[PDB]
Amino acid sequence: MNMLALTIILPLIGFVLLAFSRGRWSENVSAIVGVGSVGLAALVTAFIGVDFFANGEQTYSQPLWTWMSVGDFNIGFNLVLDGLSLTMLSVVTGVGFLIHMYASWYMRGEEGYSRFFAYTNLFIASMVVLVLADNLLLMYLGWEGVGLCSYLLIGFYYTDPKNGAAAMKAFVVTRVGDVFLAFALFILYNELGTLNFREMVELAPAHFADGNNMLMWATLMLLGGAVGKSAQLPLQTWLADAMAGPTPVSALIHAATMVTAGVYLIARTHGLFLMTPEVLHLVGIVGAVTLLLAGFAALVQTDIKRVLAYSTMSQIGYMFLALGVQAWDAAIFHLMTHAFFKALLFLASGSVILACHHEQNIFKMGGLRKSIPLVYLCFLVGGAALSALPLVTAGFFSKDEILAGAMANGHINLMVAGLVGAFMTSLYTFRMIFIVFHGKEQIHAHAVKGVTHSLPLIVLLILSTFVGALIVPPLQGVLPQTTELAHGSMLTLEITSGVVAVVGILLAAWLWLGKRTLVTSIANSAPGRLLSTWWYNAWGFDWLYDKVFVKPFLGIAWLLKRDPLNSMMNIPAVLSRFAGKGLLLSENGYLRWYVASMSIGAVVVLALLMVL
Amino acid sequence: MIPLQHGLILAAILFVLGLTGLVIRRNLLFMLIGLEIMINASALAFVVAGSYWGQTDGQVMYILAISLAAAEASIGLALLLQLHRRRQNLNIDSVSEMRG
Amino acid sequence: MEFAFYICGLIAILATLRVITHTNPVHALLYLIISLLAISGVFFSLGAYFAGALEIIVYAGAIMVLFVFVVMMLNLGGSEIEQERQWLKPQVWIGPAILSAIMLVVIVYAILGVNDQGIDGTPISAKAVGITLFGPYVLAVELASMLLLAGLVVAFHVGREERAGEVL
Amino acid sequence: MTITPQNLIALLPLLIVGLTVVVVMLSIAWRRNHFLNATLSVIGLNAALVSLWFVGQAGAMDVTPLMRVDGFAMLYTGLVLLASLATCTFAYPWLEGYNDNKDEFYLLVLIAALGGILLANANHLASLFLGIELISLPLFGLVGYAFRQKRSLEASIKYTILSAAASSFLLFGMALVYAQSGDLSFVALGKNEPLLLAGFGLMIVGLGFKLSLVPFHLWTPDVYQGAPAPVSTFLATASKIAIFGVVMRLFLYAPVGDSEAIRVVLAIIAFASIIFGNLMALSQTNIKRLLGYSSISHLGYLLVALIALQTGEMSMEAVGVYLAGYLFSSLGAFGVVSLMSSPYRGPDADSLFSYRGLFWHRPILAAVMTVMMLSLAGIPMTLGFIGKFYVLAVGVQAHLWWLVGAVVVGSAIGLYYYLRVAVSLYLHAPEQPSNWQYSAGGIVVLISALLVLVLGVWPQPLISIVRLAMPLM
Amino acid sequence: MLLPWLILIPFIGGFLCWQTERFGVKVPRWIALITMGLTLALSLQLWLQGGYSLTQSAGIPQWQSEFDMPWIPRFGISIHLAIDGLSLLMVVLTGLLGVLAVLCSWKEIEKYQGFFHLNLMWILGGVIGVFLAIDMFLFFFFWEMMLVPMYFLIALWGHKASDGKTRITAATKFFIYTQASGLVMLIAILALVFVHYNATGVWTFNYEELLNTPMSSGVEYLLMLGFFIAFAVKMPVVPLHGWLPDAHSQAPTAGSVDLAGILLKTAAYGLLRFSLPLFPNASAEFAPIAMWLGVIGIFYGAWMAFAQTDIKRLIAYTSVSHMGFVLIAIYTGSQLAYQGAVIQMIAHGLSAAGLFILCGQLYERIHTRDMRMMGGLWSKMKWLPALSLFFAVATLGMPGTGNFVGEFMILFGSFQVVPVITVISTFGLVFASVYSLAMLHRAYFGKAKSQIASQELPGMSLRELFMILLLVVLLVLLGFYPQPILDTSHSAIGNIQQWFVNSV
Amino acid sequence: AFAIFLIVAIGLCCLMLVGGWFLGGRARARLRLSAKFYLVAMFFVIFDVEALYLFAWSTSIRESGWVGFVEAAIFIFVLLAGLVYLVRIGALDWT
């Protein structure tokens, strides 16, 4: 331990190195340093995690210095390694390392190799900052750093307009979220003036004698931000388009990084949300609605990447339900399993959309089963864990523990919903899977094996199974409240889950695997078509936003392309130019005039003098 | 007898007439004439005031006023002559070259 | 000693009006002279003897003179007569007429304010006007010379016309 | 009341001038030599200045009922002499080009200058009238001195006639006030009577004409342009500086000078001259005409400090400071314009265009012309500023809000046109002096700008020195 | 004691540039440089000798050093120079930005280098003065004295625009604007010395003694308005800003570096030291309007910036947007808001300096300012795309850079005093995202181009690199470890803060 | 008694007028003739006026004093220098 710093210094060093080495490096060397650093950061995460368990699970705080000082305003650069932190961190450097290898192979011979890897190193560094957040400010360095790197990697393939504009939808939205988070910070500092988790948690019950009015806002904004970075509603619109990025990215940011950051922040501030019941209740709610809408839509995506996307959105939805109903250990456990099998799913999706020569559309694909074994198998394992297959999948244990919290707290509506959602997930997941690997092989794929591809896929497959469920996050020593346990209903429940899951997979098999004549017939129907386009279109949100925000914003911008104020001010100048000419019209060399002028002027002087 | 108001009223009336003329007239000769009528009216007033008050000042001033008169007729007619070799009539509006 | 004033005055006034109306210069200059004489008379009304006399022998005596001399040498007076008649019409005259009439009215109104304290027309010996002229006003006597002399120098630099006819 | 040796020492500069006038006119009548007549006239003025010094050694007496000789008169005389002297050292080369006789010029100059000293020294009412006749007559001639061009002549005639009309109002006014109020001396303004005011307002009409104050300003550009450039130099500095001297002193002693109606009509007039001045000054291409409108406005600015005379004594001081500033600045500008006309040739450098680069072949005249060009506009590092300063100071300090606002607004407008000009002087040159007579004018402008720069940056010397020449009260 | 040499070295510097050009067409630059190294060095020396962190609040009249000399005794006006932590910082900043403005033009010749560089020194020095000056006259004097030389720089070395406005007209707008605002602040000062003397019978144009002044409520107001307006034109606040986009559009690159990176700063710093102390009460009553014009500048600024077709002009409007935030920060008693202000002014100094220098080399390499004819520019040059990227990042308040540090402290404080406004301004932060990004895309991302001008372009000379990198480093350190700044300024800040509040 | 002086006055004027007019007539029949003629007539008017002044001086001489006389002196001397000027300018050559 005590090397908590290396878990940032490494990714950071890598980053600077790769960013100062533009193309001057052979794919193999920049791959070497890019993957390598993060690798050594994983290694250090292991060393420190081990010294942590051995040391007896003692909260470790390593203060680096003070980021800044004002009178009552003291913010510090401190790293706080506890159990939750160790989960976040382990996940990051691990899943990270893996995605780093798979990307290592995936990006061979491509615009800016060194560049991609630099950005990645910065993404890791940023995340690791985020997770070792002593306060909220250093954390905010985290969230911003993250959002940024995500903007860069999404909008990595700059040459195309659509790509970029996806990166910008990303940054804008994640930003607005980050503003809500801000407000959270400003309120929590005006009220407690410490912005350091533990202290806020104490001075919180102390100072909020008559709380439940300013604490409410603080937390609810913490939520705002959480929603933002986790793509929950209603800051979800940015997730779909996000798929415009290179696959390895859609793994990193989509499975083991950003969304997880949102949920994790909502976790660390558990004590604060607790003191504000209603908003924790909200957290739950939005989690639910999100997993639902997300599912329904994920059902219609004609694109591998985008299906997987609305998947990640629904899953994060689950996690937000787990949190919304005081099932913190459940939420985080699930976050881990989900990093596992979502990393798996996305890497695989890369190997496939690539092996199809950049096809990426399910329909223009097909019968891949025989063509590629490794990949097909991976989509089966993953897709199954995601579907929450009763055994051999950790995802089942996840969903379970979660609904165990849900029901276990008399929140049976979020429970029922969540189930409806398990049905949903199994269903769409396999619509995709079947449609991609079973049926008429339209594009003749072929396979290629290397360590830097196979190995990662293999480890992710392993950990994506029930074997993944073997690992358990040290969420007791941290103090996050234990979930209210259940029993006897634990089995009725569990089998209900397994049953809905299996019914799902089967029904998907019957729905597509044949002629699809039923599904096809029901697509062309009027209602089925209406809804079809609906769920296809993110439910209409992108529309509502582009219509009430983007359109009128740009509307103003066009409406003022020239400063109406600059002109409003040029008014006097004009008055004085034309006044100029006007008067000037009295010098006309006519002596007679000038004389008559003296005369009149005299007359005015006399009249005035008389009147006064 | 000698109501100062009437003498001064005379002075004024004349001054005004002379000015009017000065504006009405296009021929520089006539304008110069105007100017003379004016300087004369003003000196007249001055002496009338010098009569209200038992002072030699009204008069000595009048003296200066007419000294001026002379100098101005000198230079003014000299100008007119310099302008007869440039305009048959001394129509004054013709000198309008310089303008705003 | 009283009425003489008034009649002299109205006569003069009428004469100046006349000078302002007429077109043939000689008639004008003559009329302006008549006026000046009537004002010499008025001067006398107020016992401004050195004044009235001085006006007879100096103003209308040598100034108005130099004028007649120049109009006669130039002989310009005469021709352009119709060209001069074109200029004096109601349309051109009324504006300035109204203006100056107004001004006159304001002035006169402002005249009727000060206290008249009518003073007798008790003579003023020339010798007195000179006693002052060359005692209190010494410097003025000395400078009016300068005024007249400059009058000359410029009158020469302008009124003189070189021989531009002869060609090189 | 007669004249003792004292009073002669105290009429010293006036004497010396008169003498130079006669002497020079005689020499002219005998030989007709340019160089000689000039060098004579300048020896003479210089004389009149050191003479000032010898007046300084003597007492602040009163020579006749028509005069008063104090430090105030010493200041205004000193100035008017500088003005004149400069005018001559300028008109030399320009005349050297002239084909006709060159000599009558310097005479008209001497004469006008004498009249200006009568103004800087007057206390009676007649003295003023005569001082303005002396400041008018020879100037008519100076306007017409190159009557060959239609301009110069039209100018001379217009200026003459109008000038006479004004002299006429002024007279008839003096008549009305003295009539109502049986005294000619300033101090005895007939101790708000109707006729008194009236007469005073006609007097206004006249003074205002001579001063270029709206609505009696019109002739200004015509006349600044029409006349030989140096004659413009003297037409703006000497005449205006001195007529102002007399108007300050008059409205000071004059008890009616504390009146309201008059202070109002005055303020109005000032305000309006500032504004119309710079406004009409904007769209100009004819350097001269510009400097002319410019003058109308600056007479506005001083008129301010005159309206705020009753309240505070620094008032006058300001006026002095700013009158020196104005002086050296106008001598700089006009100096480079008449100096630009150089040997007579034909018409002068009316067109701004002629000025362009101009720093690329004639650098130092461009410098002088920009330093003055800023000065005149009210920028720091120039006496123009310091004067701006004082005018504002005396403005608020006396609580004259409208007038002050106007002052700043104006200053802005001016920023526009003057700034333009200097920049012109730096833009790119358009495609296309030996005598030590040109060098006079040269080192003259040079020195003068060096004054607005130094004295811009370290005003104390001038300030105190002006503070030092008070009138007798 | 040392202040004089601080104004002199730049003055004498300019003179020497001018009278060295004739020795070699290359020398003036070197002179300007060397002299700037000297000046900066001195700033750093007074930085080192005086306490890095000095006593927080001994009272308004306190200075690491002071210098007094008679000047216009008749008026009680003397050469009064005074150093603070605040002023110290503003002077280091100006010295740096000086060295850079000398570098960034190292590759631009028209007319004479001597005249250029001299003009430049008079600007820079004169403004340094505007900081060190404490005698109100000397202050005002320096204030106009710099505007002249600037207006020469714009009207004599700036490139003509796309809109058809001659450089001379930009120089004009700028000059009239700042100068006549100047007139108003002058007449204020006048009214004030007048009141102080008219209640203690002593003419002084001195800061310290003028504080004492008793004032009828309503008059302190009008006075404080004068001072405002004059600070509102140079800041800028809204209505009075257009001179900024134009003057930046037309300005030579060194001119836009110095204009954007300093003069506006002087506007704020004067707001602080003069508008508040001299008039605490009236200020206090005026804070609302001040803060609202601040939000309106935040927004209107970002919008005009984003709707920009020309680069330099967008950047300019960016500076307007940020000043909005400062103006707000000021009228909110928070001392936190003031620390925020300080660190953010110097921050945005480094930032905008960076953008205008880069935009400068970008023009040097594709002779254009209209983004409309530039895209996917990244492929072409080496560093410009990515350094431009970094500075674009930092512009919008991104942690890791100073801009965040300062804008967020500002926000914290502002919020403690008035939240509604603070939140709204933060949304301003969201707009900052939009424009900074748009700019970034238009320049370097997308279609290889929209005009033939885009083929593989020349490299970035070592000058360009090492100056832009020096700037980067600075902004990074400032984002990371702000303490030295916060401390150096904490003294003077605490003082103005205490006084503003206490006096109400 | 009185009116006789007024008659010699109106007469004197009348005569100067007629005469001047006839001289104008005869004049109608390096400077040029008309210029010279004018200059001369002018200096005549001047001499006239300044003479007025002189007489004024005359009426009271002992009452004026040494300064009065010295004044008359400088005055006349200047008038005379004015004549020397006019002559030496060549308005004499012809008349």
Ligand SMILES: OC[C@H]1O[C@H](O[C@H]2[C@H](O)[C@@H](O)[C@H](OCCCCCCCC3CCCCC3)O[C@@H]2CO)[C@H](O)[C@@H](O)[C@@H]1O
């Ligand atoms: O690299 C791609 C292109 O980038 C630029 O184009 C485009 C670029 O693609 C595009 O992203 C950029 O942003 C347009 C943004 C509009 C919405 C702003 C936010 C509205 C929200 C409302 C709610 C409150 C928060 C703010 O504009 C450049 C064209 O003006 C370049 O000009 C192109 O040449 C490139 O190909």
